[PDB]
Amino acid sequence: EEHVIIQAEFYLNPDQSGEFMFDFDGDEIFHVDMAKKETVWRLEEFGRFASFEAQGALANIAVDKANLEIMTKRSNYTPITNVPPEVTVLTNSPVELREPNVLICFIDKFTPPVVNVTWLRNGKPVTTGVSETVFLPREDHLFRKFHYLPFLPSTEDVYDCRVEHWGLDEPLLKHWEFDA
Amino acid sequence: EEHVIIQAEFYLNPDQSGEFMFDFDGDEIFHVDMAKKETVWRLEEFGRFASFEAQGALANIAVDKANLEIMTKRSNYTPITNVPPEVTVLTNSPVELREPNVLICFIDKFTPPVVNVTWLRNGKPVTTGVSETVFLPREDHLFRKFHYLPFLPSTEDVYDCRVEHWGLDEPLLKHWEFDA
Amino acid sequence: EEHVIIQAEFYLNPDQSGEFMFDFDGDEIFHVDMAKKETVWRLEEFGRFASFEAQGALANIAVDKANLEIMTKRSNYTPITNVPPEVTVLTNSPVELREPNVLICFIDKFTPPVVNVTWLRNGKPVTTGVSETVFLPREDHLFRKFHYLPFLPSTEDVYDCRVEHWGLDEPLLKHWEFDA
Amino acid sequence: TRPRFLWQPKRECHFFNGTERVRFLDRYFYNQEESVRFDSDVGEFRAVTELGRPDAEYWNSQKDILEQARAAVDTYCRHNYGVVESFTVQRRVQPKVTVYPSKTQPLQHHNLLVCSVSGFYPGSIEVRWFLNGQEEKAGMVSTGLIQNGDWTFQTLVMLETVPRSGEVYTCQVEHPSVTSPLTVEWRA
Amino acid sequence: TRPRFLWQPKRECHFFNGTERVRFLDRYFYNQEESVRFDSDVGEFRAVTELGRPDAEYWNSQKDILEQARAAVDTYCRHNYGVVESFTVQRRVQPKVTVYPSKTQPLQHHNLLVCSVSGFYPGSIEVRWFLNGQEEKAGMVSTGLIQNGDWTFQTLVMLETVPRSGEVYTCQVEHPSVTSPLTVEWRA
Amino acid sequence: TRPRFLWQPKRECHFFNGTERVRFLDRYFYNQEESVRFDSDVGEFRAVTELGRPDAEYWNSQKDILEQARAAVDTYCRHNYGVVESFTVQRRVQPKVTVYPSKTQPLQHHNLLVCSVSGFYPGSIEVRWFLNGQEEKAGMVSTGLIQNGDWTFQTLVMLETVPRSGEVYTCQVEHPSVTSPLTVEWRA
Amino acid sequence: LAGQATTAYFLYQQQGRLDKLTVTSQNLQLENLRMKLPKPPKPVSKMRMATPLLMQ
Amino acid sequence: LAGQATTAYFLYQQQGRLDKLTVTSQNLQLENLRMKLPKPPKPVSKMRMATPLLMQ
Amino acid sequence: LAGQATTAYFLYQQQGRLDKLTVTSQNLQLENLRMKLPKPPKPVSKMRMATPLLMQ
């Protein structure tokens, strides 16, 4: 019955991107969206059970940004080995023809936590009803990221998860198709 | 065609809890949630018909808190007779098997307006999709409170409304079951 | 492939009403609601594609209000010819019996952009589930406005769009009925 | 379980026949007991209990407070009436009516009739039963207007009878929302 | 019914063939009449009506304002084009097409054909009718592109004919969103 | 493609058997490498790599920082455990189980059995197969707990067999959420 | 001989359920249109709140 | 003799209505998944607003 | 002779689809009631956030 509670407060430079979350055995309790300044609970049922002050998290990210600038000067501007993001395309439940599912693109084992993920249905971009989870941490400190595409399964459509990461010379193109 | 418009602005100590509402023949026009600082209309159709400035209500509750502190010193710290909350479990419409209904737990004739209401389905707590109305007033100044549990009726499940009030030595456990 | 991007920032006096929008070939990219201080995108899919700072728009409307006051003193208080709002009642899709449609009341070619539009189902006002778009511009600078009433079509109900504009001596009453 | 302290103002607005006569009852109740009862009918600032006597004196000491309370009869109550009339006073939602049999005791056959008037507003319902077109009496045992809190009411008027597949068992409902009395019939 | 005053700026951005040539027409219209018409094609600050003449002079007096307006041809129009291209310029939604008969006069049998092209973007539709595989003419009486306001258009092109269960009554639609002309047929 | 810099703190809270023993591992990791590893088990402020050595010294220089970190073992981890217990530690969602055949190679008949345990929490599943009521072995080739990110897990344990319409092909699941082992059967 | 009864037995219940099912579907689809509505703005009507004072 | 016609009469309309009803249900259930989505954030794309000046 | 088979063929699939369709409709209608709920407030439980310091 051992459990771990973690707090991820990463900030990248130069990208002007930072996040905040609470990690409970890998899963995410919530995440403070900097843009909306809101405590976005991973499950809304948690908001009816607990609470959090979002403005406090933004103070940390400002401090995290400051430390990174301090570390950058002290580290003589050393770069980061851009690990290739091993990508696996899965579904939340066994794909059921014409039964809504959430394709899950597992952008795994990568750094820095800034990636370009685009869902391609029949080769064309999909930007309507497509969600993504905040960059989730791992034991060896390589980020995870899930992209959710609520879709009505069909054999006519072939989905893709284009994953553009600086560690990849060529863009990754993982594929999914209805076969069950 | 006589009608009454009331304004309830109660604040309790020690509980750090206060509310605000407009009473129209017992029903609630709206209520200013202190946490969200929003004019939460009881029916959203009223927001498309009227408006209210939520920040003004919070000023009153601060004044209401101040007066209660003033009255507490003047009243030589006299307590409140904790009236037992007579509880009746009802449904918004005649229970229809497998047809969504909102169980209504009528926490009636109680003070102070701080109660612990938990819905128990088959003896286990339910904290997913469970709503409650702000503490509503009465003619003799004993609060009302409705708890809403949108449920799909089933004979397999037996619901409960555990009502923990300081006036009750033992917790109240009212019961509901599908019988129509 | 010629396209036009416009920016409408009108403010009326005496009405204390001003708006903001981006016009792309007549359609509306988004509009900054002064009351909510939010960048309300016409399609929410645009919010997942672009962004806008709503507070900046409110600064313009304050400047637009100031200029109108400056122009009013310089124009010796000249009024506006209140053009009659030609009204056409249409549907978003061919009316399908018992199949949800959005009646569209086209308040067209009118000024000033303050009108009283009310949907009358069987002669009674409808104020539940009735939407309106911000006052949209035209080439000759006469505003457009669409009113949306998501309705389940029925021959029993006859809808109306009462359009009260100062240019009209008598109220306009356009009519719709299911005939397909 | 510690001693508590409660301060709930109740600013009541009583207007009769629209706004022909408006009564502004300003109640400040402390621990389910009143302190001051500023009323427009009286006009003068009063106090009900001995605890609220100092409170009334301070508020009537300043003439500005008196004017604010006295002007509240038309600024607060009357203006709000027009604002809230459109969806509360004029609110006429349909009184959905269902009639079903019921048993007075467990393990016994049905011997009661409940005329369920659920989901209406405002609360001025009337229930009257009929048998074969003839009104029945001695069955006006009503459970009262049970408020649902969602701006709706609920009432279960019960009349005792034994079904025999020989009568019509007609209930009736008279509400402002419907110009014609809403009927309902039930046969075994 | 009091005199009104309206101040609606219209900052137009005209770019042709993507962003090969960008025209920035800055219109400040007062009471449905223009005041200034700062244009990138002209570049110089002008004024249309006599009322807006002082307005133009003040704005061209400061060289900073001129630079801001002149730099707006690529900072405002051109940059926004790239930002808004993905979902407005490249927006290609399917032109749902339905064809149904209609009557020109009440109480008369159907004598019209309406090729309903509802729910598309952008507005560059084309409609052409056919009979038994042969194109029909003299039926291009269109109602025009009726904007639905929800980023969609609507058009009802009408061609007059009398159904006889002997023809196919084929309409056609040509839109950028579909690489192949969308056909539709209707037989009585 | 420019050089990057990443600063991700990892404030870990390890408690065993509820809150009997709480371990507060404070990790500040820079570019996938640790800088300081303030731990409650050690208590003393340490540093893993040579880069984080100055960071640890500054933070242990102030006694207030030490007290804040040392008090965090019960103020941060222990208090949060009670707050987050109700919906994370006690969270027991049902392990939906489906069993379907599959083919190891394309264009070949089905020769695999996948016991799909999708949609459960927490991740302590157990899978064991059966044939005609007799447990089968040598089929524990599991794909591992694939996290779905929506506070749910997923696992596809595969056992190789050839259907012959003679066996029952029973899989089993043992999870804290269900007091009784969840069974599932599949016959061709 | 029993086929007529069985078919009507299936026919009756499928028809009755589906009629109410179509209505609750179309009305549900109508709720989606209402939920997709642009959230009409705050009108000019403003309910007024009284300002309580302190108890000295 | 008429049973064949009556059964097909019930069979045809129930099948036609239900096919469209299943699609509008699955798509509705798909809208629920979309409405349950975590509301993707604000991208880096920022439309620019011009700043009008006063009329002196 | 084939009418019995054809009717049951229609009867079986219409019944099976509709049973799951009714459940996904009632549960969907139940989601509407949940979405119409008054959005229960923030409880007294407050998860605590640690305050990181600067690297000198």
Author numbering:
A (entry chain D), B (entry chain G), C (entry chain A): 3 to 182
D (entry chain H), E (entry chain B), F (entry chain E): 3 to 190
G (entry chain I), H (entry chain C), I (entry chain F): 61 to 116
The authors write:
pmcThe major histocompatibility complex class II (MHC-II) molecules play a crucial role against pathogens and foreign antigens in adaptive immune responses by presenting peptide antigens to CD4+ T lymphocytes. The assembly and trafficking of MHC-II molecules are regulated processes involving invariant chain (Ii), which acts as a chaperone associated with MHC-II subunits during MHC-II biosynthesis and antigen processing. Previous studies have shown that Ii forms a homotrimer (Ii3), associating with MHC-II heterodimers to create a trimer of trimeric complex, Ii3:(αβ)3 (6, 7). CLIP lodges within the peptide-binding groove of MHC-II, acting as a “placeholder” to prevent premature peptide loading.
We determined the structures of HLA-DR/Ii and HLA-DQ/Ii trimers to a final resolution of 3.0 and 3.1 Å, respectively. Despite having similar resolution, the density map of HLA-DQ exhibits superior clarity. Within this map, the TM domain of both HLA-DQ alpha and beta chains is distinctly discernible. In contrast, the TM domain of HLA-DR is not resolved to the same extent. The overall HLAαβ/Ii structures are approximately 140 Å in height and 80 Å in the longest dimension of width. These assembled complexes adopt a C3 symmetric trimeric configuration. HLA-DR and HLA-DQ bind to the CLIP region in a way that closely mirrors findings from previous studies. Specifically, in our study, Lys102 and Lys106 on CLIP exhibit the potential for forming polar interactions with Glu55 in HLA-DRα, as well as interactions with Gln53 and Asp57 on HLA-DQ. The interaction between Ii (chain C) and its own HLA-DRα (chain A) extends beyond the previously observed engagement with CLIP and the groove. This expanded interaction involves a hydrogen bond between Lys80 on Ii and Glu101 on HLA-DRα.
